Amino acid sequence: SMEGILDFSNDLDIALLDQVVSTFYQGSGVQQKQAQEILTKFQDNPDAWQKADQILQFSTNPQSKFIALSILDKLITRKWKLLPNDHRIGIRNFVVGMIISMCQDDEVFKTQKNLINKSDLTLVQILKQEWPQNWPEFIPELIGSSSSSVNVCENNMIVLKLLSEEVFDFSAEQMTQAKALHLKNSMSKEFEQIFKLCFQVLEQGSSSSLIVATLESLLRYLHWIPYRYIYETNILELLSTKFMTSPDTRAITLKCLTEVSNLKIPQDNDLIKRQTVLFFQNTLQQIATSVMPVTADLKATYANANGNDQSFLQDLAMFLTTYLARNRALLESDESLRELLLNAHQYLIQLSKIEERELFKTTLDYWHNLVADLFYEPLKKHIYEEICSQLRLVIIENMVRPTIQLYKSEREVLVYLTHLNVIDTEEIMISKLARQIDGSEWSWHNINTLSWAIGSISGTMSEDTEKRFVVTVIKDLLGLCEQKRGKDNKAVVASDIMYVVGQYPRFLKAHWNFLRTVILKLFEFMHETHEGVQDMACDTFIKIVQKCKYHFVIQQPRESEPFIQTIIRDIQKTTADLQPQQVHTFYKACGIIISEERSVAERNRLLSDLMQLPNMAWDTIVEQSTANPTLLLDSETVKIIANIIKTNVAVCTSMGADFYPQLGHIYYNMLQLYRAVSSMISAQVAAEGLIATKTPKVRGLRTIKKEILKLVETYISKARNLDDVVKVLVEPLLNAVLEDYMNNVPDARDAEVLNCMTTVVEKVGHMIPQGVILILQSVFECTLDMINKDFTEYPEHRVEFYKLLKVINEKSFAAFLELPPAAFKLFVDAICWAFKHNNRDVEVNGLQIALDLVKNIERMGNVPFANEFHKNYFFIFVSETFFVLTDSDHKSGFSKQALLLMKLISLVYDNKISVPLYQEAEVPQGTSNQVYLSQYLANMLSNAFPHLTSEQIASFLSALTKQCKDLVVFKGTLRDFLVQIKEVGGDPTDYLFA
């Protein structure tokens, strides 16, 4: 029954509309949902705007009137210029009159702010269409009507605010360049009058609502107006004193002054410098006397969250940081301005103690700006000594776990603060460390925080004081650990001791005996079953190795051998209690050390001894798994095998090219294992169905295949000897993986195969033209058929697929030339199919492949293949590119779309396409591709966007084609087109902007 309002043959029952609206906003459940679907259908009715005058007049429901204005908004925005001229004036008069009457009724003006704001915005939309060319007296009459009524004056400030926003803040995307410039110049030409009104209201008072609405509009003006309106008037005085005292106006005034601190200002005038100092001086004065003194605990204030205190403290931080980052130098020379400078920063110190992450990041960005300047700028740091000393404590106490982003920012500022005064930094940290020992500030969180801080200032001190400091820190940390009972407390402190030493490699390198003791102790922790200790031991081990690897590979004094040998001799015993992942980290860390040995005979010997355990386990399995293959059904054998390969991946990751000898030890048997495992997966899917791929047994088997592929990928990507890669690795690899991939059902194909091949083509693709062809033959068509039915299925395959085509198109384009025409046609289909993705990973590659393909064809010159390509696929790429450019569903790809399109158009206007792109019959002979290209596009756009005039399409194409050597301008023209297609009656002259 609610669906009655959707019948436009009969009169609209406003009472029925008010019921449907009420049922939507105030109702609930099924009825609310039903009303919602009805209101949408009503609003979306193209004739609904006609019934807007009835609703806005007869309805008593403010929500219904709001929805009516929304219907009108759509009409003005999109179809305004299509209306008869009479209807344009009617709507305008109706909207103006409506706003006037709402302002006159103090009851309505008071209780229907949302409906009045909506009406004002609706007025502004009319202005964007009509003003000033068809409404030159709008601003003069607006200023006139202001003096008559406070409510009207206040509302006029809301209109001017919205106008300024639509023209200067939100115009770039929503209107053409020409139209934007027009409205900007129009506002600019009449602002002299607008400011006069605004300044008079502010200076004469006295309605707070009027003042606040005026200051809110002023905030928008400050985004674009010339600085003279701010400095050549008394308005800074008003903001920085009068309006900072009242809390009603304090919030907005502070935002205004924050923007004033960003105005375009001539920095050679001394009078303006005085003004800039003055309003800051006045503002900090009002805050000290009206809000809180510089000593106030802002941390506690913020936490209490009374009223708008939090927003205020946020805005104060923004104001202080913004102004001081630009103008603090104005306060540093004058002795009489010193107190102001330091008080301003003292507020920031207090603000930085607030517990609020995003606010802290804001102050921390400023502190970084300051300490960086004090670090380079002469004679400045002594001024801020007391501020910097406080800051050291603030940052040390709020140091976070290494968000890592925030840690890096905290470390950076603290490293600066360490240079500015090393002695003060040391004193604070040791002091804090003493308070951890006397238990006054003892806490798991507090000891961790301090350890992160102490570790962050590494390699900033003197090697000598660094040593002296580290010894002091560790020695005291060592004593702290004894003091605590229970492994809970002892585990925390012990971990912090390992953290700090891992942060000071310069110290460990200089004292081998100590470093050696550290590592042996980490090996003890690899047996501790206490939670986190084993991970902590392994993380620290590899962390230290990365930084001190040279001291593990060389024969140190008072040692019979390099320590790396000692680690390997007991590697079984050391890693016996570790989890598989932890064991892999251990082996990878050994690989880091081994790779430093530049003696090939020695490096390979160390590699053999390191891989002794996995190679014996491997040899045993390969021997018993090949006789008989039943062993692979055992989950344990599958897990053992996967771990062996993972260990090879871990070592290969850190050793790269040097891993080759170890790879050769297992390579041929490994590929045989890949075949055996593959047969079992197929056998399982045959015997159990596709559900088999979900079972642990098959997932275990597939893991083996994937780790094998990962190992090969890891080595080839880092190989220095590409001859061996080609002549030893590639052919057996391709024989083992390609046919298996092609002849598996879709749900059994590993996407890692595609990724592996991407790496192969990347490194040696230029050397295996026959190999690349074999790769395409085996993966191209069958993978495309997996992913060309929707954008959803087989996401991994989808991404790797286009990465593979991408690298093949770059490295071995000849492989595509060998494709049969039908297969090449699929290749083109595949590229375009990639355009239509929302998936970033797929879309970008699709566009790049297209661009690179065009360049590939171009480099062929005037040859039969290139000419046929253009005849077949040029206009396909042009129209497909245009489609995603204009459909409003691929806006994330605009730039590359623009580039691809610019390249395609330039080909014709540089006459790089030798053959005609048209049928010999459809156009007269001798016609240039340039002419035919204009015709094709004109016809294309005409049918795709029939609401565009022929002149629009013509001007756009004329501008587009002539600008195909200037990307930023070209893109401008495209943006203007995307705006014009959203509306009717766009101006063809807009395209003459550039």
Partner: peptide
């Protein structure tokens, strides 16, 4: 278990 005595030793020399 947790006993950093050897670290205290090697550090007290240097």
């Amino acid at each position: 278990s947790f006993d950093m005595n050897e670290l205290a030793l090697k550090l007290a020399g240097l």
